[PDB]
């Protein structure tokens, strides 16, 4: 099958039916973190959550950052948007962070108890009418019901394809956010400006020339 290195030996914990049936399996565990199956289940879940919030974050970076170079959407830089928004806002950032900690902690603890027990949040009586539509969908980390409204996960002949598109776009968006942080510290401009500079002069404006990323040369 496909692998992150042709010719390297695939680790024996990533070559089982439970590991090969997951999503995006290419045999990449050189540090051996997923040798424990309980750890691999927990890390599957952590990867899915980092994938989805990284895609949402990097979309919030790029689409306002692309459209601010066109006419509409005068949006500040992503490392200035918190300051500009909290000047525009009504609440202090501490109160806004406290509200998001409570509202996220509720939902997070729901997901946490679903990871602990899969058939957990469907106790009859524990929710007003949520309780029927808060079980899993036989695969943990892929809930149903109000999550996924449009029924795209109903056809089984598309399902591994949707999984693998999600895990690839998520890993690529995580690389994009680590890039956003790194470029921000190195260059001092926005990522669309970094892309415009690498398109204006590729052979002279890159990380070999910024004077930060490799300072021995």
């Amino acid at each position: 099958r496909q692998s992150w290195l042709p010719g390297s030996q695939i680790p024996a914990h990533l070559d089982t039916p439970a590991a090969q049936a997951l999503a995006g399996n290419f045999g990449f565990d050189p540090l051996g973190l997923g040798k424990d199956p309980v750890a691999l289940r927990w890390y599957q879940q952590a990867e899915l959550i980092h994938c989805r919030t990284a895609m949402a974050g990097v979309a919030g970076i790029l689409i306002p950052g692309l459209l601010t170079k066109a006419g509409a959407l005068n949006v500040p830089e992503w490392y200035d948007a918190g300051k500009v928004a909290i000047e525009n806002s009504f609440a202090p950032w501490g109160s806004l962070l406290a509200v998001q900690l409570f509202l996220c902690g509720f939902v997070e603890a729901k997901r946490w108890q679903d990871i602990r027990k899969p058939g957990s949040q469907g106790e009859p009586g524990s929710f007003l009418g949520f309780e029927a539509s808060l079980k899993g969908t036989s695969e943990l980390g892929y809930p149903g019901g109000p999550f996924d409204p449009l029924g795209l996960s109903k056809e089984a002949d598309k399902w591994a394809d949707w999984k693998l598109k999600e895990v690839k776009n998520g890993r690529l968006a995580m690389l994009a956010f680590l890039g956003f942080v790194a470029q921000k510290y190195a260059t001092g401009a926005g990522p669309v400006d970094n892309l415009a500079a690498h398109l204006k002069d590729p052979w002279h404006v890159n990380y070999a020339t910024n004077g930060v990323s490799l300072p021995f040369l």
Binding site: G7, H204, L217
Partner: peptide, 30 residues
């Protein structure tokens, strides 16, 4: 500029070289 040409050399030579390395390790695998 010197360091960008050195890094592009590292990219191309590391790709080809690493193919050579892992074909030494696993002989028909590339």
């Amino acid at each position: 500029d010197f360091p960008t040409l050195m890094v592009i050399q590292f990219y191309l030579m590391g790709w080809a070289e690493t193919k050579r390395w892992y074909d030494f390790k696993n002989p028909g695998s590339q």
